[PDB]
């Protein structure tokens, strides 16, 4: 069930779903930009126009099984206060940013520095507090924050915030320990909001956890597979399953490389779950 033949046919499955969804010149299927400003962080990775989360982001709904999480790219300069929006709207019990602290120091990639210090986006404001710092296996850290989104009027949202400062591969170890910090501290946070009596734990549409690497198509995909593998509602759902959920619902990249797909697979195989569909 984890051999080479498996493994063969679940990547013929899953090329055949990357072809099938890559996108056109102006695809009715992803979202364009509305105006002289750039959307997408990379001109061929795009964003589903039926889950897109706001119109001037490349943003996704996306759920895996009975898994709800908003999975997106590194935000631009320019998308800094829709993103903010995103995050205080969704009342977001964990942001998971998995570029690592010297991508972002890295100004030719045009990632600004937004969790890390405090700042102001428009009519936001936003605070940065450090909290814990927790090893998660292999000498890779997680730095933790809170973010908080204020806007005179407005109700103050604040975000914790996990922080991968190193990805190198990454084990399915690392991966399986961050998908447990990152769950637990959306936990922790969604307790919050529903003993406040929240109206937003009843909707769909928010309390999800949001995941970015840098264009949110690699690293990103390779955690919420493991969350969602971390779901115990989630019994049966096949690795064809969760990685075609992800790509129709926002785009074909989804699980760009092949060690993220081996690092879903593993998990699998020390779960008995299924590659694919039978």
Known sequence: ????????????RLTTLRNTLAPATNDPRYLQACGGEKLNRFRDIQCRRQTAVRADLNANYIQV????????????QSQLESHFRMLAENRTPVLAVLASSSE???QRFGMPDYFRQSGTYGSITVESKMTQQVGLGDGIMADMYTLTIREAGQKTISVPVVHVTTWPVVSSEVTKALASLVDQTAETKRNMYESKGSSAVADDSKLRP?????????RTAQLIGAMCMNDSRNSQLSVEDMVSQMRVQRNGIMVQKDE?????????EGQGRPLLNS
């Open 1 to 12: 069930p984890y051999g080479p033949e498996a493994r063969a046919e679940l990547s013929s």
């Open 65 to 76: 099984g009975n898994t709800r999480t908003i999975a997106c790219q590194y935000p631009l």
């Open 104 to 106: 972002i120091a890295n």
């Open 210 to 218: 949001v995941i970015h690497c840098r264009a949110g198509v690699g």
């Open 260 to 268: 993220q797909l081996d690092v879903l697979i593993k998990l699998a």
